Amino acid sequence: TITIKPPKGNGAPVPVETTLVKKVNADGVLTFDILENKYTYEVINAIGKRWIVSHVEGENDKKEYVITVIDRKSEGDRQLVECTAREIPIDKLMIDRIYVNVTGSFTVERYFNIVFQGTGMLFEVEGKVKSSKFENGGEGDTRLEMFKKGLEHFGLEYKITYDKKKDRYKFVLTPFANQKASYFISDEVNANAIKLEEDASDFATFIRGY
Amino acid sequence: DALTSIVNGRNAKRNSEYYL
Amino acid sequence: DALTSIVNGRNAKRNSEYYL
Amino acid sequence: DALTSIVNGRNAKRNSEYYL
Amino acid sequence: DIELTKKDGTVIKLSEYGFIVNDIVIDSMQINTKYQDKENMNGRILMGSNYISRDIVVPCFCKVKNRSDIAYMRDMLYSLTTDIEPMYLREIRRKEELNYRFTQPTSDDYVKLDKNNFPDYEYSRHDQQIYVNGKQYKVIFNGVINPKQKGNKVSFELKFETTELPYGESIGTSLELEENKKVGLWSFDFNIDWHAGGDKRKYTFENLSKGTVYYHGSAPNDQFNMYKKITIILGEDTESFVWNLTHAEIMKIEGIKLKAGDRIVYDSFRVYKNGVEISTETNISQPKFKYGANKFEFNQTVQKVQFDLKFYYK
Amino acid sequence: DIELTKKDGTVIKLSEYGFIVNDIVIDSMQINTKYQDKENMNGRILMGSNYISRDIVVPCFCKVKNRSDIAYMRDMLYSLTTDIEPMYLREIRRKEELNYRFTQPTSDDYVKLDKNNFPDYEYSRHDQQIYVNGKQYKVIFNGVINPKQKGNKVSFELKFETTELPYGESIGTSLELEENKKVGLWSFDFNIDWHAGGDKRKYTFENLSKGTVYYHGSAPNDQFNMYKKITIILGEDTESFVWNLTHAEIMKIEGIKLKAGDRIVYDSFRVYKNGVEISTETNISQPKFKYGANKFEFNQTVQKVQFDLKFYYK
Amino acid sequence: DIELTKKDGTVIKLSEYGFIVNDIVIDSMQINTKYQDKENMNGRILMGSNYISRDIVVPCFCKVKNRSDIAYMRDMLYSLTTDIEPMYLREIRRKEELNYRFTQPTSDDYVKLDKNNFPDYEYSRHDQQIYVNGKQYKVIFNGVINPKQKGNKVSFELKFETTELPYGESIGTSLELEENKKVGLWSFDFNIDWHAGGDKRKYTFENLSKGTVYYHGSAPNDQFNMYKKITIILGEDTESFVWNLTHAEIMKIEGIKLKAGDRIVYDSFRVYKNGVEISTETNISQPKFKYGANKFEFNQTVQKVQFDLKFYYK
Amino acid sequence: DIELTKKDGTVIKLSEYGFIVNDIVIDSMQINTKYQDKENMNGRILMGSNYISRDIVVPCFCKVKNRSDIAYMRDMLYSLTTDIEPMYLREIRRKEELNYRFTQPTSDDYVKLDKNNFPDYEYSRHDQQIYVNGKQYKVIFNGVINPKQKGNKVSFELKFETTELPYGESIGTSLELEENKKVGLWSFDFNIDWHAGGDKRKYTFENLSKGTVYYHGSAPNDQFNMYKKITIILGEDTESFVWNLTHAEIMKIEGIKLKAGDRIVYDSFRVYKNGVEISTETNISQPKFKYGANKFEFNQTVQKVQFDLKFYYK
Amino acid sequence: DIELTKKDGTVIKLSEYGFIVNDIVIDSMQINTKYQDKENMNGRILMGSNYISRDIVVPCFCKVKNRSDIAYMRDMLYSLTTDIEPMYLREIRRKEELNYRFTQPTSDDYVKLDKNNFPDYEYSRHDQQIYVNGKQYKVIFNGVINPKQKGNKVSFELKFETTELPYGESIGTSLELEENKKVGLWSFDFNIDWHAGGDKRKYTFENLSKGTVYYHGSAPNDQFNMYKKITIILGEDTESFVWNLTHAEIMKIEGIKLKAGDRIVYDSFRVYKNGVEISTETNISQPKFKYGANKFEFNQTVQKVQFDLKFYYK
């Protein structure tokens, strides 16, 4: 069901209930709970963290994630493994830092190219976007949070994709990332419990700017 | 009394992978 | 697991009108 | 609704002797 | 009415141990449903429905020659039955409500008595009981009380329960069906043709792109815990290897290169490329035999296929 | 008293399988309410009220010729009935409590006996049972125990339950009502006029801005899970297309341009613009047939409307 | 039918205290299961299964000569039985339903009467009751009510319960089996050979790398709370010391240097290197005797092994 | 059968108030256990076990001369019994099921009738009932309903319950045992020797390093709520003062200097150095009398020890 | 057997309305306890214990002349009784089970019949029923069902319940006891001396530092909801004003200056300094009359005290 492999080499499947979560720009994450069995024994007693999970959603959606948390509980004469995991197109960014302090004016392609140095992944902007200046680089910081700042300045949203090619992850940067979807919803047909919340405690009609 | 721990534990779980 | 959400939701409610 | 108070109360208890 | 138990390392039957039984009653499988009710719609969606557990009940009593011995006998029962160790239960019935036969009251042809003080109606060899069916059940015990009616008679109420899968696991593989070596273990509950070597008995084919299988089991062998186990001599070299099947999903093995004479052991959700060093990354999909015709279709005329499995019932 | 079951791929009836039944009792639908009590007001608001489930019960027993066979028979029952697979149940009744008829005790005109040792009161063709009604039920099984009364008689207590929607789905569409081709499947429970081609049978109209429909089903076909399916040849070109309906909501199709000869397949909450490539963004509203007169009103005289649906009952 | 109780500091039996009993019924052990249901799989995993408690029940009544005395007698019962103090219960039975014997109505051979107004059927020494089995139970009391039927007869319903471990602790060690000094405490429930000094009685071996043990107890002595206690004169000097065992785990003692004549007392999960100053850091693993053959294998021919233990039953 | 109640400020008995009773039944003490189950071990640890509550039940009915009076009588019952005020209950029994005696129907020796219309079988002084035992119970009431059977007879079902400690507090101290002044309050339930001034009656010793005590109470006086109260004239000056005791813990008084003629009142978990101004910092340990021999050992030959206590029962 | 109800604005009695009753049964007061169990101590602390509710039950049936009228009668019952409006219930009994008296069958002295078809046994004025006691109950209704036995007889089962305080509020104040003006409302359940103007009737004293009060109510008037109301002409000027009382607490009025002729109305937990403009800051303490002697002690010889209150019962 779920093909997991060490960071070096071969795969091994396990059946387990999964709980995935995906946001637009924020990190996706999943969680699941393996249990000891006559099966799964060779794996469960031999998982070390940063085990590489993949083949969620079957023989498709080969979005390879990595485990970082590992719980191990004892239930009866058996044992559970709750665990968590994160994307490689995000973790692989949390891998590397930049020490050269980016500073001054910066066009978007230059900025999101210096940060994709050695990672191998690829970025591209769709529409024309302006440029601004970044005051202090994150010399002691991830590529990820500088990516956050860059999105906050220039590309207000993004969307990753595992392109057809191996070891590639195209970052379509875009303001207000969207694609049309043929499906739909309604209270009768697909929407059990509609909680509409309208929060306005920090809201505005006119506003000043300097 | 028994209850604070479960919620705080799930909270600390959620502290993993909440941030870009 | 089910429980963290209700408390955190009421907490965010309380974040409205707590301050002079 | 009933529940927020017990957790927050235990939390304030824990605020006693948490720090060196 | 003996309630045979095959444990991991032994075989036991109660009536051998002075333990008559009143009857055996086997519940069906507790169907756990998973419905979801839409908020304002006169109808609720089926998320799922699923078998869970086949709770058995067996009340057994026992007579002894003296009141003290009750204790011993009872302890034996517990030490003999109450086993968390997953056991294999086999049910037994009689073919007839046997009576005492005619005799002659001429100081001869007197009646017999069992080790227990009862009248032996079982005069001939062909009187005693039989394994009513060629199946078993993976079973565990639940709590009992022992009311002592008068004398040396005491009753017990065993409450057994299924262990792993709520099904009537058929004993013996499908190859013992193929090779008529082992005798027993094949009851008429399974509608099995006598034409050994004919169709709907054979699970050993040669030099075929596509072939036919009759899964005699009413319940479907989709669950991996069942002992569905295939092994194929691939016949022809290739780089990829697909095989399709009905009442199941498609299966691929892509990305690894094979050879003709190399054999694949295709266990449940598991693939031995050559018997060891499992190469199971390719299209994790497990096959499913439902009942009757389960037609398969390979793609390059394997020189051998053969597969043993176990029949499961509901 | 046969309890017919149409499963996905087969048809079964118990009394064919030596399984008499005592009766069938069908509960009504469990109304789940949704009330809300105001704090200090002598009365509670109705948020909602909604049908949920139609639990069926059927106790069936069986006789056989010998005690062993009980086991086989019981297993057959389980393998034949206990199916998470959503089945379609059809009820059967008799028209009369049949007796044995007069005969002659003159070494002739002797009595018959069924395959089971019972007296065949069904002398003529017109004796045996009937599909009492032209409807079915989407049904799943729940747990059974099998008390064995004496001899070869054993009882069972089937507890069936509705699957998706707690309603009496009528078998056969409304077009089989239109074209009197299929025979059966139309019982007098449905107050249906004989005037085929007349009003209140027809669901195939031509060249009309507005027309009339008689939904013979007491229960309302507002739920999408029901097989309400419309198809219309629009008759006249337009840029927008509204049609109204009573006992339901208004429907628009705005923002997409159409043509006259183009046809719309209007499935439940779904719109095929031309049979494929569904263009269902426009005014997601589903139509609702309640009972009797369901008058529709188009706006530009469609050259054809026709729609098949299924009648549902409570 | 006396319900003996050995408390910490005394021995008591009810019928000595004017307290007849109707019977004793001993439940089996409440098996607490630990299952886990997979979400959409027709079968649930066994995390564990485990014995918990062996609830005993004993209804006892009492007659006295006058109505007042009831009170005293009742209080005695409470003061005599209801003890949170973990007691050791021993069951008693009779060997026969005794009757009054033939006599002679010739102003002689009259009948006797007990201290309580009952007929003494126990004429000879060999009439009275017996410790039916050589085992006990660690037991505590639970709530009782005292309905007073007429006269001086009043009933009570004692509900005892196991204390630590739900098992039939065998009284007396295995060395009393070795040295046939203590008499009693060995019932035929334990299938024990008479060949004292022969195999399957001996737990005192000399000068052996490997040897054989017959654990007569059906229940397994894996739990540490049981009085499994080994002591070995190691025979040969070494730096490390491994010994293996079947129906159990491997045991090492590495990292501490020993000598030949030095002795190890190997208590449950505990190691006295030389009787005191426990050196129990090395491979914390406790041995487990299941039943029958429990073969051990040392590695350097210990000059002495001997070990006493207690037999436990289910 | 009177159910005496001593309240804080008065004494009451029901049958004085026209309130016959059917019986009194006294439950034992509800043992609350505190077990802990280890996760995968066939046995559960005893954290503790503890007596809680001794629920009494007393059904009492009443007859009156007229239907109205019922009301009054009932109210009296409530006003007389239902008291949250912790009361001291004393049970009463009869010594005999009394009958009417022989008389003479000669217009003489007629029969008597009580204030209630019943036949006075209690002819002589020695007929009426007795305090069956020299103990009481600290008791509170729980809810009652009053079904009125016919006429003037109405029943009630009192459900009393222990207040502080689930025990049979013995009335009167142990000094009234010493000085045979108060009469009554000493029943044969307590196995008490007549040798007043002899051993096992005396709790007043002089000039001894060590001495002997017989605590006649089956239940142990470890709980402080019991009225265990010691007072000692220390005999010899010292700086520290230790005294040991069996079925209890060691006691020290260190860090405070004393004198010989000074006296210590050693109340439960409390120490008056000289009757007031409690100096109880030194080794807070309370003594515990279990049953029978409770040997104490002082260290410097106190010139006087004497201690009163209360006997408690289970 | 009439079940009088005084509602806010009217008086009703059932038997006036053709509504016979079978009986009235009045439960005692549900004692809600508040215990706390110490963790390892054989005894549990009483935090509190408290009366809650006095649930009344009254089954009443009714006969009418025709079947239709049942409906009307039933509705009347509901409209007459089921009132959330806190009502005051008064119980009624008979003094005798009345029979028909002797008559003469001489075409004269025939028997009477009530408005309902029953025999009037109530020949004389002194036959009919009576307010059995001079008290009431603050009461509310709970759900009823109406089984119709045959004919015109139908039964009902009223389940009444106390409203505010679970007590038998005595009707009429204590001043109507003082001034023997109102007649009725004083039953012998209250042990009241005839010596009007004598002690234990008077609640109107003059020129006294200390005086005596007999609270005839068994239940204690500590609760403020009861109509305990005092009024005192203070007699002597002062700056502070203390008065003590037994079975209650001390009371001060400090910090406010008073005068002699000024009067204080001392209502429950409330102080009118001069009838209005309540000055109730000083020592908020409410007085409590328990039963019998409630001695008060003022400090400066008030020229008048008098206080009305209501007697409450349990």
Coordinates of N, CA, C and O in Angstrom, one line a residue, chain G residues 154-203:
Chain G
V154 N -29.9 -19.4 58.5 CA -29.7 -18.1 57.7 C -28.6 -18.4 56.7 O -27.6 -19.1 56.9
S155 N -28.8 -17.9 55.5 CA -27.9 -18.0 54.4 C -27.0 -16.8 54.2 O -27.3 -15.7 54.6
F156 N -25.9 -17.1 53.5 CA -24.9 -16.1 53.2 C -24.4 -16.4 51.8 O -24.3 -17.6 51.5
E157 N -23.9 -15.4 51.1 CA -23.4 -15.6 49.7 C -22.0 -14.9 49.6 O -21.9 -13.8 49.2
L158 N -21.0 -15.7 50.0 CA -19.6 -15.1 49.9 C -19.2 -15.0 48.4 O -19.5 -16.0 47.6
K159 N -18.6 -13.9 48.1 CA -18.1 -13.7 46.7 C -16.6 -13.4 46.8 O -16.2 -12.2 47.1
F160 N -15.8 -14.4 46.7 CA -14.3 -14.2 46.8 C -13.8 -13.9 45.4 O -14.4 -14.0 44.4
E161 N -12.5 -13.5 45.4 CA -11.9 -13.0 44.2 C -10.4 -13.1 44.3 O -9.8 -13.0 45.4
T162 N -9.7 -13.4 43.2 CA -8.3 -13.6 43.2 C -7.6 -12.2 43.5 O -8.1 -11.2 43.2
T163 N -6.4 -12.3 44.1 CA -5.7 -11.2 44.6 C -4.7 -10.7 43.6 O -4.8 -9.6 43.1
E164 N -3.6 -11.5 43.4 CA -2.5 -11.0 42.6 C -2.5 -11.6 41.2 O -2.5 -10.9 40.2
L165 N -2.6 -12.9 41.1 CA -2.5 -13.6 39.8 C -3.6 -14.6 39.7 O -3.8 -15.4 40.6
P166 N -4.3 -14.6 38.6 CA -5.5 -15.6 38.4 C -5.0 -17.0 38.1 O -5.1 -17.4 37.0
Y167 N -4.5 -17.7 39.1 CA -4.0 -19.0 38.9 C -4.2 -19.8 40.2 O -4.3 -19.3 41.3
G168 N -4.1 -21.2 40.0 CA -4.2 -22.1 41.0 C -2.9 -22.5 41.6 O -2.3 -23.5 41.2
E169 N -2.3 -21.6 42.4 CA -1.0 -21.8 43.0 C -1.0 -23.2 43.7 O -1.8 -23.5 44.6
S170 N 0.0 -24.0 43.4 CA 0.2 -25.3 44.0 C 0.9 -25.1 45.3 O 2.0 -24.4 45.3
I171 N 0.4 -25.6 46.3 CA 1.1 -25.5 47.6 C 2.3 -26.4 47.7 O 2.3 -27.5 47.0
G172 N 3.3 -26.0 48.5 CA 4.5 -26.8 48.5 C 5.4 -26.6 47.3 O 4.8 -26.4 46.2
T173 N 6.7 -26.6 47.5 CA 7.6 -26.3 46.4 C 7.7 -27.5 45.5 O 6.9 -28.5 45.6
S174 N 8.7 -27.5 44.7 CA 9.1 -28.6 43.9 C 10.2 -29.4 44.6 O 10.5 -30.5 44.1
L175 N 10.8 -28.9 45.7 CA 11.8 -29.7 46.4 C 11.1 -30.7 47.3 O 11.7 -31.8 47.6
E176 N 10.0 -30.3 47.9 CA 9.2 -31.3 48.6 C 8.8 -32.5 47.7 O 8.6 -33.6 48.2
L177 N 8.7 -32.2 46.4 CA 8.6 -33.3 45.5 C 9.9 -34.0 45.4 O 9.9 -35.3 45.3
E178 N 11.0 -33.3 45.4 CA 12.3 -34.0 45.4 C 12.5 -34.8 46.6 O 12.7 -36.0 46.5
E179 N 12.6 -34.2 47.8 CA 12.7 -34.9 49.1 C 11.3 -35.2 49.6 O 10.5 -34.3 49.9
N180 N 11.0 -36.5 49.6 CA 9.6 -36.9 50.0 C 9.5 -36.9 51.5 O 9.3 -37.9 52.2
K181 N 9.6 -35.7 52.0 CA 9.5 -35.4 53.5 C 8.1 -35.0 53.9 O 7.5 -35.7 54.7
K182 N 7.6 -34.0 53.3 CA 6.3 -33.5 53.6 C 5.3 -34.3 52.9 O 5.5 -34.7 51.7
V183 N 4.2 -34.7 53.6 CA 3.2 -35.6 53.1 C 1.9 -34.9 53.1 O 1.6 -33.9 53.9
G184 N 1.0 -35.3 52.1 CA 0.0 -34.4 51.7 C 0.4 -33.6 50.5 O 1.4 -34.0 49.8
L185 N -0.3 -32.6 50.2 CA 0.1 -31.5 49.3 C 0.5 -32.0 47.9 O 1.1 -31.3 47.1
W186 N 0.0 -33.2 47.5 CA 0.3 -33.8 46.2 C -0.9 -34.6 45.8 O -1.0 -35.8 46.1
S187 N -1.7 -34.0 45.0 CA -2.9 -34.7 44.5 C -2.7 -35.2 43.1 O -1.8 -34.7 42.3
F188 N -3.6 -36.1 42.7 CA -3.5 -36.8 41.4 C -3.8 -35.9 40.2 O -3.6 -36.3 39.1
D189 N -4.4 -34.7 40.5 CA -4.6 -33.7 39.4 C -3.2 -33.5 38.7 O -3.2 -33.2 37.5
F190 N -2.1 -33.5 39.5 CA -0.8 -33.4 38.9 C -0.4 -34.8 38.5 O -0.3 -35.7 39.4
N191 N -0.1 -35.0 37.2 CA 0.3 -36.3 36.7 C 1.8 -36.5 37.1 O 2.7 -36.1 36.3
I192 N 2.0 -37.1 38.2 CA 3.3 -37.2 38.8 C 3.7 -38.6 38.9 O 3.0 -39.4 39.5
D193 N 4.9 -39.0 38.4 CA 5.4 -40.3 38.5 C 5.8 -40.6 39.9 O 6.2 -39.8 40.7
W194 N 5.6 -41.9 40.3 CA 6.1 -42.3 41.6 C 7.6 -42.5 41.7 O 8.1 -42.5 42.8
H195 N 8.3 -42.5 40.6 CA 9.7 -42.8 40.6 C 10.5 -41.6 41.2 O 11.2 -40.9 40.5
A196 N 10.4 -41.5 42.5 CA 11.1 -40.4 43.2 C 12.6 -40.7 43.0 O 13.1 -41.8 43.2
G197 N 13.4 -39.7 42.6 CA 14.7 -39.8 42.1 C 14.8 -40.1 40.6 O 15.9 -39.9 40.1
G198 N 13.7 -40.5 40.0 CA 13.7 -40.7 38.6 C 13.5 -39.4 37.9 O 13.4 -38.3 38.5
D199 N 13.4 -39.5 36.5 CA 13.1 -38.3 35.8 C 11.8 -37.7 36.1 O 10.9 -38.4 36.7
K200 N 11.5 -36.5 35.7 CA 10.3 -35.7 35.9 C 9.9 -35.6 37.4 O 8.7 -35.2 37.6
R201 N 10.7 -35.9 38.3 CA 10.6 -35.5 39.7 C 11.8 -34.7 40.2 O 11.6 -34.0 41.2
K202 N 12.9 -34.8 39.5 CA 14.1 -34.2 40.0 C 14.4 -32.8 39.5 O 14.2 -32.6 38.3
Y203 N 14.7 -31.9 40.4 CA 15.1 -30.6 40.1 C 16.4 -30.3 40.8 O 16.6 -29.2 41.4

